[PDB]
Each structure stands twice: as structure tokens, then as C-alpha cells.
Amino acid sequence: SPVCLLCLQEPGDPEKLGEFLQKDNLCVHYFCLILSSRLPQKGQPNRGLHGFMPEDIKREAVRASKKICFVCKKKGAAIRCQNDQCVQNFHLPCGQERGCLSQFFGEYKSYCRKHRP
Ligand SMILES: [Zn+2]
Ligand SMILES: [Zn+2]
Ligand SMILES: [Zn+2]
């Protein structure tokens, strides 16, 4: 049963996590890609996964493997609350159960519930 490399969950609800993408030997939710806090987009649009290069995605999985999700208490949390004085990290699906807010513009920031702008 395939899982997203960034949140470690199954395809789930595409309205909440985006389409489940499979390319370059990787599986990832589209929103996990665009909301991942420190993921560079260094490719042209027809490269990698919409310009997100497989190497960078994997490096982002590695960075996140050292971060604990405040919701489920497991490693692999790739999203960080973007309030400057907050250290909460979370998997996207987990954050969505606890009122975390994601923005789909600009730096594509997310916030924990206490820091919703
Ligand atoms: Zn995901
Ligand atoms: Zn989690
Ligand atoms: Zn916060």
C-alpha cells in the first residue's frame, strides 16, 4: 500500500492533501510537496515533480526524519509552524486534525492553531 514520503500516510483525501503523485521512484501528496517548509523548487515545470526535484524531496524527507510531529509523536514531520517563536512541527494530515492552517500562496506557510494569523 503506497505511502507519501513526507507525511508517511496513504493517499487519503485529495481535497485536503492534494493528488497522490508517483514519479521518479517517489510517492508524495501534492500538498505535502508545496507546503513542506524547507523544500526547494529548482526544476523547470516539466522536470521532477512539477519542478520539485527528487534529490531535494529526499533530502527534505531526511531533514524531517529528525523532527517529531506534535500530534502523533512520530518522526518525519516536514511542516513547521511559521510563527517565528514557535517550534511545533507536524505531518500535514496530522495538523489538519488539530486545526493547523495552511496557506496556498507566497511562501506557502502553515501555522499551528495558536498561531493562525
Ligand atoms: Zn503526504
Ligand atoms: Zn503526525
Ligand atoms: Zn505555532
Curated annotation (Swiss-Prot):
* Gene disruption phenotype: Knockout mice are born at the expected Mendelian rate, however male mice show significant growth retardation from 4 weeks of age. Overall decrease in body weight is due to reduced bone mineral content, bone mineral density and bone area. Decrease in steroidogenesis markers and a resulting decrease in testosterone and dihydrotestosterone in the testes. This results in an increase in the number of osteoclasts and adipocytes and overall increase in osteoclastogenesis. Testes conditional-knockout male mice are infertile.
Q: In which tissues is it expressed?
A: Expressed in Leydig cells and in developing spermatids (at protein level). Highly expressed in Sertoli cells in testis.
Annotated Zn(2+) 2 binding lies at C69, C72, H91, C94
- What domain of life does the native source organism fall in? Eukaryota
Q: Indicate which residues the UniProt annotation says bind Zn(2+) 3.
A: C81, C86, C112, H115
Assembly with partners or alone: Interacts with MEF2C; the interaction promotes MEF2C binding to its transcription targets. Interacts with GATA4; the interaction promotes GATA4 binding to its transcription targets. Interacts with UBE2D2; the interaction inhibits cleavage of PHF7 and promotes association of the complex with the nucleosome core particle.
What this protein is reported to do is described as:
E3 ubiquitin-protein ligase which ubiquitinates histone H3 at 'Lys-14'. Required for male fertility, via inhibition of SPOP-mediated BRDT degradation when in the presence of acetylated histone H4 in early condensing spermatids. Stabilization of BRDT allows it to facilitate histone removal in early condensing spermatids and promote the progression of histone-to-protamine exchange. Promotes the expression of steroidogenesis proteins in the testes, and as a result plays a role in maintaining testosterone levels and repressing osteoclastogenesis.
What does the record say about domains?
A: The extended PHD (ePHD) domain is required for interaction with the nucleosome core particle via binding to DNA. The C-terminal PHD domain is required for histone H3 substrate binding.
* Full protein name: E3 ubiquitin-protein ligase PHF7
